[PDB]
């Protein structure tokens, strides 16, 4: 759908506020937070998988963050 191609990082952004700046700023973060609240099971699985895959604690946190972000993002 058109709604999945937000036209955000295209550049050509000037000092004037863009269309739906205030909302689109945090809409994705709100959506991810709502998904993480409504699907606590998958978050635990992602935490366990990140704990297993990554040796360095930074690697584990990075994998956990990426996996949690991509989980609802596909859906």
């Amino acid at each position: 759908s058109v709604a999945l191609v937000p036209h955000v990082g295209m550049g050509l952004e000037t000092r004037t506020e863009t269309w739906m700046s205030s909302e689109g700023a945090w809409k994705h973060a709100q959506r991810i937070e709502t998904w993480v609240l409504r699907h606590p099971g998958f978050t635990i699985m992602a935490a366990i998988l990140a704990y297993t895959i990554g040796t360095t604690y930074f690697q584990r946190v990075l994998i956990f963050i990426l996996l949690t972000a991509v989980a609802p993002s596909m859906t």
Partner: protein, 495 residues
Amino acid sequence: MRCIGISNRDFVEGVSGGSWVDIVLEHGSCVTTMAKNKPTLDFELIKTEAKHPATLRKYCIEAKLTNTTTASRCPTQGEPSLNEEQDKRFVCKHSMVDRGWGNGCGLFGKGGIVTCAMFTCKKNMEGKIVQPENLEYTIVITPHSGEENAVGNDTGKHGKEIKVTPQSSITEAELTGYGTVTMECSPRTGLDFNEMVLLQMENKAWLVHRQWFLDLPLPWLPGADTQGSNWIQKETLVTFKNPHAKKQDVVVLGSQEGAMHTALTGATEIQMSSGNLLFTGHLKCRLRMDKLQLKGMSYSMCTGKFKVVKEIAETQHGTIVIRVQYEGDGSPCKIPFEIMDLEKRHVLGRLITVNPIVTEKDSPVNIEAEPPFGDSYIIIGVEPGQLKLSWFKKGSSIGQMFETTMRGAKRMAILGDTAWDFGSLGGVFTSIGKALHQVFGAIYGAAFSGVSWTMKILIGVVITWIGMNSRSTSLSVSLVLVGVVTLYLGVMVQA
């Protein structure tokens, strides 16, 4: 004096050989330029217009399906055919259905089925494009004459408006009494309109990336189609449902205006009704102050009593604007005006309305000055009847320093390379910086195009951590610097 009251007002001081200085004009922002012997001018870019736009594509945001037909074949007889399949205004879909003796077939298997429905668009959005040479930039130049009705006034009748086009990029404005100001603008290096589309949906219009517009997933016409009977991606606005193998039918999806509004986040909204008026973007011009002269500098000190008709009012940029009316003889006279200390033994601040003069004895004249950060006294007039106005400026010099540093960094973030021309005087350090930032910005745009601000933050954090944990200090420093810059850009993006 139009620049007074704008929060994005910015100051340019100094000139080069030939008394010129480069300035970048943005629609929201106002620029006040100061020179040693030149009058203070306010520059604002008030209008960008695109003329004779040409449509690039028409998209369908709402459609309706009619004239549904179906055709089915037996399990092993191959795919069926419909007359409409050749038809370009009909949208078709092939599938398979369970077939057997019950259906009237005579053989049990997954026979084919094809259903076609006529596609007719109801609402569309016209993606117009414009040639770069058809842009016209209107710039209003207003001198700090001190006129009473001139402070933060935009109604008109105070300055001069010069229209700039790419064909005629050099233009002269005759500021009656202040000489003539010449603008050697560079419209072609601003927004690159060969890569931008004017997108108009119903009564709202946006300026969008052209490749983004071309990659949109909606049915579209070539743009020159008066018939609207060959839509190219009808598959995106219809859905063929075969819940159980027995039947297949097709339904059109709903109005996509709402989906487009979400898809347009991060696109600046323009006006495309009665002219493709853009109130977005910047323009870089070269200001020529050679023929620009002060007004009334051959006058004499007023030597009369003044009265304050408008009280001191500090602006958002640390300057004060007052309105004084003259009461004495010798009407066309220079106004004595100093910003001294309590004992009047030092001169602490300058005035931005350079050479305030009284054109008419019955007309209030309003002066803008920039007092110091401590206590300063705004003295107006001569010894008999002099009026000393006390004032106190809240800021601090370090505060101003880092405020200007942040403002410059933000300017660099928005204009990129053009930020090195904002107050440039043709120096060598400025040119080295602009070349370096051109190369780095090209690399950065290549490596960060189409990325969200949250992703920018995450990538900056990863890069900064890699730098913070690295054996080679040189690479460590470079990576940490890149990471901090990327984090700042992610924080300041989505303006």
